Structures are given as C-alpha cells and as structure tokens.
Amino acid sequence: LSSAILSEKPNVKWEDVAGLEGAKEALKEAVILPVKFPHLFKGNRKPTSGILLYGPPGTGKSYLAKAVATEANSTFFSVSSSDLVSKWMGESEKLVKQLFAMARENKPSIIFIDEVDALTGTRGEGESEASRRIKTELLVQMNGVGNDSQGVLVLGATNIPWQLDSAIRRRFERRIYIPLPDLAARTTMFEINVGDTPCVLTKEDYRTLGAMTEGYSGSDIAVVVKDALMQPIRKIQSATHFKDVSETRKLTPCSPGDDGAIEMSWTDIEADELKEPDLTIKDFLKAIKSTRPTVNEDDLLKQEQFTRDFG
Template sequence: MYSYGSFKDQAIEYVKQAVQEDNAGNYAKAFPLYMNALEYFKTYLKYEPNLKMREAVQDKFTVYLRRAEEIRAVLDEGQPSHTYFRPVAKPGGCETGLNSAIKRENPNVKWSDVAGLERAKQAFQEAVILPLKFPQFFTGKQQQQRTFLLYGPSGTGKSYLAKAVATEVNFTFFSVSSSNLVSKWKSESAKLVSSLFQTARENAPAFIFIDEIDTLYGEGNENEASTKTKTELIVQMQDIGYTDQKILVIATTNAPFALDQPIRRRFDKRIYIPLPDLKARQHMFKARAMNKIIE
C-alpha cells in the first residue's frame, strides 16, 4: 500500500525519466512520462497534510504541467497551443437593435503582444489555460476558475489582456460596454445582459467581456432599470461553472470598491493590472515605432 511519500517518490522517478527523454529530444516518450508524474503528484497533493510540503510540490507540479503543455503542442504537428479547442461556428444572432450593442470577435492577440503584466498572465495561465488543456488535474478544490475581475488604472491593457486569453484558448469573444448600456439601452439593459449570456451559450466555448462594469454596477446607481440589470447579471453569473461549463467571464473596472458586494462575490478571482514598468514601456515603444520613419 502506498504512503504519501511513495506517491511523491514515484512521481520524481517518472520526472527523471521524462527530463532525460526531453533533453534527448524524444518528446513522444517524454510526454507520457510527464503525464504519469503529474498523476502521482496529483494524488500526493490530495492527501499530504503538510501545507509547506504541498506548496513546494505544487510549484513543481505547475512547472512540469507547463512543460507537458509545450511538448503536447510540438507533438500536435507544431500547431499553436490554442488549436486544441474546436473552432466556434458563426453565430446566428446579434443582428440589429438591442443586440447590436453586443460585439462578437475572434481576436488574434498573442501573449507576446501584451507588454509586461507577467503576474497577470501567469494567473490566467494557471487559472484558465492549463485547466482547459489538462482538466484531469484540476478537479475538486482545484477546479478551473471561470469569472474574473480585472482592476487597475485606465489604459493599462485590461481589455487587450482579455483578448489574449481568448486567443490562447480559441474562445469566441463577446463583449459589451457598461457605459453603452447605461447611456444607450438603459431601459433594456436587463434584456441585453440576458441576450449576451444566451448568445455566448449558443456559441460556446465563449468568453464574455464586460467593460467598465463599475459604470453599470456602482453603488448609488439605483433606479428600477438598474436594479433589474443588477439582478439579471447576478442570476446569469450564478450558472457559470455549474450549468455553463464552457463560458468564461471577464469584467474590468477602474474602481473595484465602487462595486457593491453581491457582484464582487460573483468573481472567482480578482487580478490587479498595474501601470507598465520600464521594460513593458520599452516593449510598447519598440512595437509602435517599428517600421515607422521618425524625423
């Protein structure tokens, strides 16, 4: 009978073999060895009572899981990682009137296009991308998170990062601006929220992106139409992760504390998007100055 330690020892043995084959370029042999190691690590993490030991092994688990992902992409005829997910069919809705406020995209924003934001990208890698590609390792308490609130100053790349995540997993990107709801469709906002989620379900897997959610959901924004919209959004988000397994939601705000508690609790993860550091600013300058004549 296995003890906790024997699960870890067996995982380490598989890792040694995987690394050896990996270094030799034998990816077809390395991949199943990494997967076997991950299975043993997963069992060890499930039963190990020592928190520090679990944290140390979890870090290693993530490293090997990412390497397995990279090898899997190589084995899949060199295609990008997001090709493991089926393409989404063209939608039949979102035509005119109310639904014209909903934008549908198939974004093409790569990780490398997003300057800086390494912590945010790592958070999405661990919370979204890896669980989608290796769902067998993310069960129980480690299940994939599906609703995210990006907060931080204006112009820091929150929307751009959301599109990069959608590109990475090949999800169709449905977006709506809260300011547009408030100013243009105020009396019909609740219907638009319902339509947004329904359209995403019909075209799953899909990303729902709600920009400037504080405009719609801030405290003090109280009237009959606003109350209906808030209630509708909470009801729709309750199904995410339960009946809607292929829907992800990202919302952005510059003022997270302006949101009232009921909606804040609906987000599985809140990610801070800071101002770009020096390295990120250099990256952006080079990208925008490329192929341009500066006199």
C-alpha cells in the first residue's frame, strides 16, 4: 500500500481566460458535456480520453488547467514528474498503476500532468530505465489490455512538443496549440487584471494599450499590470508631502506645496488611512517601456512547424 494521492481546490473562473475558444469548446464538451449529459455518450459515441495543450510559455496553459480544476465538479487529480519517479526500482511504476487505478476508482475524474516532456523520448538510449519503464507503464496503463479507458481524462501540458515522442503524441489524441493572445484578448486581460482598482481609462484606451503591446505573454501582462499597481506606492512614499482628501482621515501623495500639503513620509502615516492615487495611463505606458516580450521568434517558428503540421 503506497497511497501517494494528492488533490486540492483552486478558484479560477471560466471567463477570466481570454481567447482560446477552441480550447474552451473542447474542454466544455470534454468536461461539462459528459457530466451534465451522460446519456448522449453511449456505445459508439465516446468521450475524449487524451487532450494535449502546448505552445509558447505563458500563453495561458496551466491557468486554463486551473479553470478546468475549478469548473470540474470531479475528482481532479494532478501530478508532476516528482511523485512518479521513486527511489528503488519498483515504486516508480506501481505508483503509476495505482494512479490510474484510483483515478478509475474515483470516476468521473480528470487527470492533469504538467510538462510531460520529462517522461518521453524513447529515441536513443539516454534516460534508459526510467524512460522505458515509466513511459511504458504510461502507455500500457493509459490504454492497454483491460484498462477502462472510459471515465478518466489525461490532460497534458508542455512547452516543447517536438521532443515529445510520436507514440505519446498519438496517446494525446486531441492536441491544441495555444498561441500568443491577440488585440482583443489582451484588452480583456487588461480589463480583468485591473480588477477592483479604480482606473482612469476607457475601453478603446485599453485597445490603445493592446495595440502598443503587440506580442506579449500573459505573464508580461501580469507584470505590467503589477508595475502599474506599484507606481502609486512609489508616489505615495516618494519625496516629502501628503494631503487629506474626501470615513475619518485619508491622505495621499502630492507635490511640494499644494492644497493641504503637509510634509511627511509614508512611515509617518497611520494604518489604513493612507490611499494611493488611482492608476493612470502614464503608469501603463511606463510599464510598457519597462519590459520586453519574453518569447523568441525562432521558437515561434518551431511552434508554427509543429502547429502547422499537428495542430
């Protein structure tokens, strides 16, 4: 008895994911449609067993897995490469067998695996015993002699899909490329990541932002919005001078010599009773000048190679 089980409860809505309506369609029909409508899937009509996601880093793959994990209403397992590779010789493989076994015990269920590139690559003889034994058990235990392939669902993620072996490529029978977001999706992620903070701009100003930010990732958006949320702390504690505005006392940074401009530091000011100036357009453009796009374009050419073939 090993019992290396782990699962959890995150919180990510559908509509906080931008773009990706093919992936949204495939996962709604792969998750919501079996549970809500089990009678449609009978006999010849069977649900999808293996779904792969891939693309450049930070196009929203693992965050989409978070969204499926919240919107599952199913026993959502998730395993990295850590819990599969064991010490001695035998628990490296029997834990895979118990993983799909107990996964079928808690059916209907969804299994996610992140960065499956650490388990593939049978070509050559490098990474020999772990690759052959563990990867062999992933193949045969994924489907094989008497595996109930119905029920569970194997979600694969990677950043390198060309080093993924063709056999596991066939195992993940419905693969989806996740590109960089376009204008409108990044407008949506701007309007989501501003959140409850009182902004200053309009929708077409976010369109001006997404036009300015051609070719980012989701993390790039997260950090320019983060820097945009970190400019008013810099201004509220910068130099010398705050000022009362308006539930009992509330002071914000202002220039030297202004309407009610006392001279002080943030340290001088009482818990809560300090508020920073609302995010402004300049903070956005300053954050745009702060950070390059993360990804490189020849890697995008390889994503267009594998996507242009197998996508």
